[PDB]
Design a binder for this molecule. Structure first.
Ligand code: HEM
Ligand code: HEM
Ligand SMILES: CC(C)(C)OC(=O)N[C@@H](CS[C@@H](Cc1ccccc1)C(=O)NCCCc1cccnc1)Cc1cccc2ccccc12
Ligand SMILES: CC(C)(C)OC(=O)N[C@@H](CS[C@@H](Cc1ccccc1)C(=O)NCCCc1cccnc1)Cc1cccc2ccccc12
Lengths: 453, 453
């Protein structure tokens, strides 16, 4: 299998037998993508075990894969097992089972439903404030991934099930635990070298999702379903949709995938944002000023005031450019095709190296720097929406994007209304990224929180 | 997985864990199909390991699967590994790779090409006669599977490569051996219980085709290709087609599958025919008379005289009804569908129990008896072409049917022109079928050959 890219005349590193190029992952997906872009140029290939991965960087080519030829050729992401019943999760389903779930859950993430979810997301920003203030009156450095992880979990439970917990002070509630539990850890590298073992593990009901987590949430949902039936969150929006319609095991899968999609992403991004704010105190100050110009007297943000804050949107987008937590985007080529002059054989995984593209000098001036002005209403027109893809692009992009941006912004407004964030001596400057398989700091971000009082 | 047919309300035997119903194969596919038709009626289900197989017997339903919904829903047969490069063999390829090979090789089996192949198939009938006459002048019972196996091989080599051998007297020629080498033998039952092992064996290049056979024929073809290039058989018909076009490894796969398709089928059917002729000497006598009425003075049969013999066609079809060497027909349901009022879930293998249908009293009077008159020009109109399916039906039926019928008939004319076949004391009467996984006699058919001289 290791003669395909050599046969198509596509450059790339030379693969060892069995392993492919996976030894190149010793410095992380992102460093390997960067080195590969620099070495081989616009298009290259490599092998995840025996799996040919063809990396592309042409905006027209990226556009054709993610948007134009989605329903026909590039419909699925690369397979993932063992998954068990999570096969029905939208992000894992394939072909016509996805296209059906994508429709049942699309009206769940409309602007109308999202503005309604704002008051509930607003109540736990206040919870975050009081909890941050307890840590601000003491004088001890704050770990963001904990205080934000507690907040991100607070929004999920309330916006997906109506379960109302202060998870930071209730870290030992049974509903809070099922969730805090890396494609370069020993198991998945083994899966990439021995993918012939996935069908073994699937017949043994061994699931990459912990079987106790999914067993707890499955019965926890069926309790909520028959307590409301009969006597604003995602579950209620999915129950109303099954009233082709959403099944009862399908509905529990999506609820899990919503948490598993929304938890460490929301938490880890606010951490990258607050890091950048504290190491560029000017940007934090201007953001604090725009916040107080729109919401004077520490006013509670609303849906419309959040869309009014332009410098806030710039800080978010610039952070996501720096740290695009997907790192990559991937589609499985289900048929032989020629797009933009390049023949792609069936079965190849086409990959768009997001992190690398977001840091390419040929598209960004001083790409390593934190310059929110790249996205000002003046310059935001010069950015190719296929070079900047933090939520991906096309019919299979992030279905929760609007919710994510609105969630993270409501947090930042309330937190910056009341506090200022200054680096510590133990704050890692410059921040270094984890050489693992997840986009995250090598050491958790720790900052000093002060009160505007 | 073992709750599907119970959920759809479809009757059938109860499956043990892991095994499914495979213990019911202890008396052969055919006895199990018969018992199942009698017990459960028109539609039933069972499990090959974990694989749901839904058996159908409604002619309209059979018609929809094999003909109407072929290109959309029921395009492939149930998977088969480990196969290696024989994935490209027409009978194994899937979806759009099959539909392309089916077209490249369809004009190879036209009536025009087949009438041209008749003189070459005629030369080795004479070889068979002299060889049978050597065994007729002695006085020793003749094993048909050897004398016919030698003949069937003779037609293949000459009609597929131009290789001209008297295989019966040259049993030790290297080209003759690569070919004489059961889905109920230990390996394939293991594959049916542990199908998660096929991807293991495929990455070990272990192939159900012997790797020495395919390595011999691969290089043997590339010798013929460049000796004709540049300086009437199947290879030449496939070389002219690649002049989307047929590849060089694709072309060797089909050549193998033509032998492997045409060898034990042609050989074993003539054996079933000569058995029935010898145990019904009246039918053999009438067939001998029709043969001599069309070809007087032991004339050499031609293409048109073969299509003129009506009682010969009746003997063939009635034998194939009795012994339909496919036993079953199978299609993999690639999408959820409802046909003829029955919902079929995606992935289920739909199976048509040919052998059972060919022996159903509700469609055949005295079905166990050898009555060639069922197919006379009077009664041949009352036979549902979906109840009688010796070559299957629809766009994925036997591509070599015309060649097979013409091949077996030319053999029978020449053999019956010169000899008469009478049972032995060691001839198994009534013939008993192998309880294994292939349709064949439990003991090889042995008959006494006499000369009309
Ligand atoms: C900062 C927050 C987030 C970022 C940066 C992000 C990014 C992404 C990206 C890049 C993709 C793949 C898009 C593609 O393949 O082109 C994706 C998919 C997805 N996201 Fe997110 N995401 C975020 C938050 C969320 C949230 C809060 C949810 C809540 C439900 C969510 C649900 C999903 C789902 C279901 C998919 C799979 C979509 C599909 O396969 O149809 N995401 N996200
Ligand atoms: C008495 C002789 C034969 C009988 C009874 C027979 C019967 C069958 C049957 C029942 C099928 C499956 C049809 C279906 O799925 O509906 C089949 C397929 C096939 N046969 Fe035969 N066959 C015979 C001889 C031959 C010969 C001589 C060849 C020579 C090339 C051949 C080539 C094929 C191929 C390639 C397929 C697969 C077709 C496809 O998948 O497109 N067969 N045969
Ligand atoms: C690794 C491999 C090459 C084999 O398969 C990919 O190609 N890797 C995608 C699968 S990881 C997986 C992680 C996970 C699974 C189940 C439950 C929770 C997490 C996954 O399916 N999560 C789906 C959506 C979760 C999500 C996370 C972040 C943002 N939004 C949604 C990685 C992947 C798939 C789909 C969307 C993604 C979005 C961002 C980052 C990775 C995403
Ligand atoms: C057993 C399983 C349920 C997993 O898979 C089926 O469903 N079993 C079909 C595969 S057996 C296989 C045997 C074979 C393979 C490779 C080389 C030679 C023989 C096969 O692929 N041979 C394809 C065509 C050969 C042929 C034989 C007889 C007549 N014409 C053609 C069985 C099967 C598939 C396709 C056509 C068949 C025709 C008659 C009988 C069986 C046929």
């Amino acid at each position: 299998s290791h003669g395909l890219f050599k046969k198509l005349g596509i450059p790339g590193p030379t693969p060892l037998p069995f392993l492919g190029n996976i030894l190149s992952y010793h410095k992380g997906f992102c460093m390997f993508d960067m080195e590969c872009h620099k070495k081989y140029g616009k298009v290259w290939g490599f092998y995840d075990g025996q799996q040919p991965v063809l990396a592309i960087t042409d905006p027209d080519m990226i556009k054709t894969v993610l948007v134009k030829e989605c329903y026909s050729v590039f419909t699925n992401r690369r397979p993932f097992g063992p998954v068990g019943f999570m096969k029905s999760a939208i992000s894992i389903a394939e072909d016509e089972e996805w296209k059906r779930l994508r429709s049942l859950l699309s009206p769940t993430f409309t602007s109308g439903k999202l503005k309604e979810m704002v008051p509930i997301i607003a109540q736990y920003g206040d919870v975050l404030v009081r909890n941050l203030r307890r840590e601000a009156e003491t004088g001890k450095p704050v770990t963001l991934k904990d205080v934000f992880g507690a907040y991100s979990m607070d929004v999920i439970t309330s916006t997906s099930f109506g379960v109302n917990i202060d998870s930071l002070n209730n870290p030992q509630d049974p509903f809070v635990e099922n969730t805090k539990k890396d494609f370069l850890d020993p198991f998945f590298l083994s899966i990439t070298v021995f993918p012939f073992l996935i069908p073994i593990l699937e017949v043994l009901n061994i699931c990459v999702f912990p079987r106790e987590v999914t067993n707890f949430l499955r019965k926890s949902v069926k309790r909520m379903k028959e307590s409301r039936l009969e006597d604003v969150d995602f579950l209620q929006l999915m129950i109303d949709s099954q009233n082709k319609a959403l099944s009862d095991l399908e509905l529990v899968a999506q609820s899990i995938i919503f948490i598993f999609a929304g938890y460490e992403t929301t938490s880890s991004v606010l951490s990258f944002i607050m890091y950048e704010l504290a190491t560029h105190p000017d940007v934090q100050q201007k953001l604090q000023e725009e916040i107080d110009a729109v919401l004077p007297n520490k006013a509670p943000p609303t849906y419309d005031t959040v869309l009014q804050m332009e410098y806030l949107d710039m800080v978010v987008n610039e952070t996501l450019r720096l740290f695009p937590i997907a790192m990559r985007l991937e589609r499985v080529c289900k048929k032989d095709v020629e797009i933009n002059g390049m023949f792609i054989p069936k079965g190849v995984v086409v990959m768009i190296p997001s992190y690398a593209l977001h840091r390419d000098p040929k598209y960004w001036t001083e790409p390593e720097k934190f310059l929110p002005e790249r996205f000002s209403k003046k310059n935001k027109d010069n950015i190719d929406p296929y070079i900047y893809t933090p939520f991906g692009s096309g019919p299979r992009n992030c279905i929760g994007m609007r919710f994510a941006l609105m969630n993270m912004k409501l947090a930042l407004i309330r937190v910056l209304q009341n506090f200022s964030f200054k680096p510590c001596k133990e704050t890692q400057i410059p921040l270094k990224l984890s050489l693992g398989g997840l986009l995250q700091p090598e050491k958790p971000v720790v900052l000093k929180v002060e009160s505007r009082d």
